[PDB]
């Protein structure tokens, strides 16, 4: 397997970011790739047994490091806004032609003004009585609105356990103000159940959005609460009518 | 130098349709060819690879032929499933060293064939801990395309396929909401071409 | 300078029989001159030659894609490199220079600058080959992709019988003869 | 029928390494570690084939790290010196005032570190001399060739002086006429 940390990170221009990667396949060669919103996959560095082979990146801005054959770490000395991308770690048996084995990826967001970071507001909307009598089904709708950047993970929880069946979450957010560059986002999700399940008052439904934001060590000099990594939820119990 | 060119833009197919992702490469060395698939929420992943010049690779119903004379590696599948929705990468690397050139990935979205369409626009409410009131356009077949709102204070999401697994039921749904007092579910999806038999209850 | 020395050696050997028809591959690691671990194309896995290479054989065989890579090495590495330089290695033919001079109870035939090293040199008495008293220096490799060899003849140089050195080399369709 | 060998080594504490290809006992090419360039044994070979030297540098780096690991496994047992056999000859029958080449052949030695010097009438000669890299052997010792192109004369006398750690005083092979 290939393990990456962190999964998400938001920071300001001129800050330092550090990525870490571990592969357990026993391979000699590890890679760092940059993936942008346009789905272009370009190599940055390649290490083979603690020795750098490939460097396709801007000189003097990055600082890879590998104390072990199974570790490959990346460091960005000063992040520019163009560094916002998904950074993938990969491994191959040796430096010869081989299959690449990737990690999950690190989503980095570099912002000019950390004051445009907002957590989401989460609201759940109860099923329509008309839908219940027409289809015998009941779908709840969750609205996560006003968050930035696009670092959220939505999930549905029925009676304390996470559910995946009957769930659809938008693959892409929609900008509240598509004109502005750093516009806050909105995200919807539906959970559909049978009418009898929603019509049981003993059933509890909760939409949960995991927001990835700042850290307790981050300096926040504003009237708002610091938009730290946090969970925002909204709930609704079943209704007999 | 080494280059890979594959199909541009998102590809949207209904399940069962034959897929063709064109891939053309240009290299001065003798390469090995790859196809990588990236499912949602994961990283890229090897589909198959062909080391020698005129062989064929295959996996999960996908197939591509290393065509040395045409310098092509076209990916094909006779009947795409909804599970094939992902980004597909055509990759090249010389056989003497691992310098992998990826093409601009092609996103494939496979849509289900809705058996019994029942299109309707419903209105939902809550504990009114939010000044919004959402409208739900649901149960329409995959032909319907949801148009994005051109009102700045009206928000419309795109269609989304949820699967109720226990009852073998798939449905499409889009959500529209606003805080304006003149926003109603009757006019919420005017921007889209929806079925004429769409059901609007009396709210 | 008398401090100890430490030598690591790696030899990736490709052995060909009837061209690329039968190919054997050997991935060999050496500490000083002792082979401690080896992959043999006939065996199909890394095996420890000595207990010094015991950790590597178990570790390398467990790596994902290792066996598939090494088991394909005959086609992907040995047979490939054969054709990369087949035109100037396997097909290399250099015709030889043949020099005859005494040095005189001993007549010598000097064959120089030929490739490949496969050669056959005979000595004819007059019309029948003298197979007695002939000593050869063997095949000496000059190191510059050329060979040479010296065949001597402990014969009695008697005027009026001709002496002919006959060489046979894959560079020639017919034998080469030189008369004293 | 044929044997092709990719031979690599790294030596400590000298921190020296070589990477070469061997076809039936002859060098096809080697990679100059300092220049990071492929060096073909015959200049014509470079027109029909090619090699990416960066792959060799990667392999030598792995052998350097492996040597430290392998040295630990043996509890730091060093190499045992093996003296060389030196032979001096000529690639053509010698003729007065007719150009020729002297070949100093160093064989069956390890470690691969040598001081070879040509001596014309006891005085060193460095003009025109060539040399091969360290070539492998089946017993996994090494061999090497040194070439002195010379013009044969009845006055001149030649010598090949080889210094190795398996010897004490240098080995000196003579040639005249």
């Amino acid at each position: 397997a290939v393990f990456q940390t962190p999964n998400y990170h938001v920071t300001q221009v001129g800050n330092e970011v550090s990525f870490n990667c571990k592969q357990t396949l026993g391979h000699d060669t590890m890679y760092w790739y940059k993936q942008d919103s346009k789905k272009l996959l370009k190599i940055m560095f390649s290490y083979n047994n603690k020795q750098l082979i490939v460097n396709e990146t801007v000189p003097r801005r990055f600082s890879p490091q590998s104390s072990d054959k199974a570790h490959l770490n990346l460091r960005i000395k000063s992040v520019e806004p163009e560094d916002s991308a998904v950074y993938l770690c990969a491994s191959s048996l040796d430096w010869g032609v081989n299959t690449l084995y990737f990690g999950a990826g690190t989503r980095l967001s570099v912002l000019e003004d950390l004051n445009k970071v907002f957590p989401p507001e989460v609201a759940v909307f109860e099923p329509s009585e008309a839908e219940i009598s027409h289809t015998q089904k009941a779908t709840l709708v969750c609205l996560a609105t006003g968050f930035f950047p696009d670092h959220v993970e939505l999930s549905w929880w029925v009676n304390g356990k996470e559910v995946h069946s009957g769930v659809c979450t938008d693959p892409q957010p929609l900008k509240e103000q598509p004109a502005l560059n750093d516009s806050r986002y909105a995200l919807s999700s539906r959970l559909r159940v049978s009418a009898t399940f929603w019509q049981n008052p003993r059933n509890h439904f909760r939409c949960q959005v995991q927001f990835y934001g700042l850290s307790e060590n981050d300096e926040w000099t504003q009237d708002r609460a610091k938009p730290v990594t946090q969970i925002v939820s909204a709930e609704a119990w079943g209704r007999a009518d | 130098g080494d280059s890979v060119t594959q199909t541009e833009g998102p590809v949207t197919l209904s399940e069962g349709t034959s897929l063709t992702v064109n891939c053309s490469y240009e290299t001065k060395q003798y390469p090995t060819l790859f196809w990588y698939v990236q499912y949602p929420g994961e990283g890229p992943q090897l589909l198959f690879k062909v080391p020698k010049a005129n062989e064929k690779g295959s996996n999960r119903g996908f197939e591509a032929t290393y065509n040395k004379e045409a310098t092509s590696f076209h990916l094909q599948k006779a009947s795409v499933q909804e599970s094939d929705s992902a980004v597909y990468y055509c990759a090249l690397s010389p056989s003497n060293t691992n310098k992998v050139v990826f093409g601009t990935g092609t996103r494939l979205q496979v849509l289900p064939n809705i058996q019994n369409p029942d299109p309707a626009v419903y209105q939902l409410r809550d504990s009114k801990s939010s000044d919004k009131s959402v409208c739900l356009f649901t149960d329409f077949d995959s032909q319907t395309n949801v148009s994005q709102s051109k009102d700045s204070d009206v928000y419309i999401t795109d269609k989304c396929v949820l699967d109720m697994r226990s009852m073998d039921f798939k449905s499409n749904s889009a959500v529209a909401w606003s805080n304006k007092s003149d926003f109603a579910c009757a006019n919420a999806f005017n921007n889209s071409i929806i079925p004429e038999d769409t059901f609007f209850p009396s709210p | 300078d008398t401090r100890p020395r430490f030598l690591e050696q790696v030899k990736h050997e490709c052995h060909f029989f009837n061209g690329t028809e039968r190919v054997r591959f050997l991935d060999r690691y050496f500490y000083h001159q002792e082979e401690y671990v080896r992959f043999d194309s006939d065996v199909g896995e890394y095996r420890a030659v000595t207990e010094l290479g015991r950790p590597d054989a178990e570790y390398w065989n467990s790596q994902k894609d290792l066996l598939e890579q090494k088991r394909a090495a005959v086609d992907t590495y040995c047979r490939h490199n054969y054709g990369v330089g087949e035109s100037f290695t396997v097909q290399r033919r250099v015709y030889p220079e043949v020099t005859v001079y005494p040095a005189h109870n001993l007549l010598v035939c000097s064959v120089n600058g030929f490739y490949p090293g496969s050669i056959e040199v005979r000595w004819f008495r007059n019309g029948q080959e003298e197979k007695t008293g002939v000593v050869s220096t063997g095949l000496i490799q000059n190191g510059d992709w050329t060979f040479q060899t010296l065949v001597m003849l402990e014969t009695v140089p008697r005027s009026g019988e001709v002496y002919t050195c006959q060489v046979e080399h894959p560079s020639l369709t017919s034998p080469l003869t030189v008369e004293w | 029928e044929h044997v092709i060998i990719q031979a690599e080594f790294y030596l400590n504490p000298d921190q020296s390494g070589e990477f070469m290809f061997d076809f039936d006992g002859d060098e096809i090419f080697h990679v100059d570690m300092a220049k990071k360039e492929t060096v073909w044994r015959l200049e014509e070979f470079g027109r029909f084939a090619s090699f990416e030297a960066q792959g060799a540098l990667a392999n030598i780096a792995v052998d350097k790290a492996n040597l430290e690991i392998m040295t630990k496994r043996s509890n730091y047992t060093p190499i045992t010196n093996v003296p060389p056999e030196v032979t001096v000859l000529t690639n053509s029958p010698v003729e007065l005032r007719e150009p020729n080449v002297l070949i100093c052949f160093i064989d069956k030695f390890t470690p691969p570190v040598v001081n070879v010097t040509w001596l014309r009438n006891g005085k060193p000669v460095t003009t025109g001399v060539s040399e091969t890299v360290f070539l492998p052997r089946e017993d996994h010792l090494f061999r090497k060739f040194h070439y002195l192109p010379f013009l044969p004369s009845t006055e001149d006398v030649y010598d090949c002086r080889v210094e190795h750690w398996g010897l004490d005083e240098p080995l000196l092979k003579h040639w005249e006429f």
Binding site: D28, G96 | - | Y59 | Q6, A49, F51, E52, V62
Partner: peptide, 13 residues
């Protein structure tokens, strides 16, 4: 043509 190198493998630690 282009020569090709069997890569050196990192020994177990």
């Amino acid at each position: 043509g282009g020569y090709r190198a069997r890569p050196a493998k990192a020994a177990a630690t």
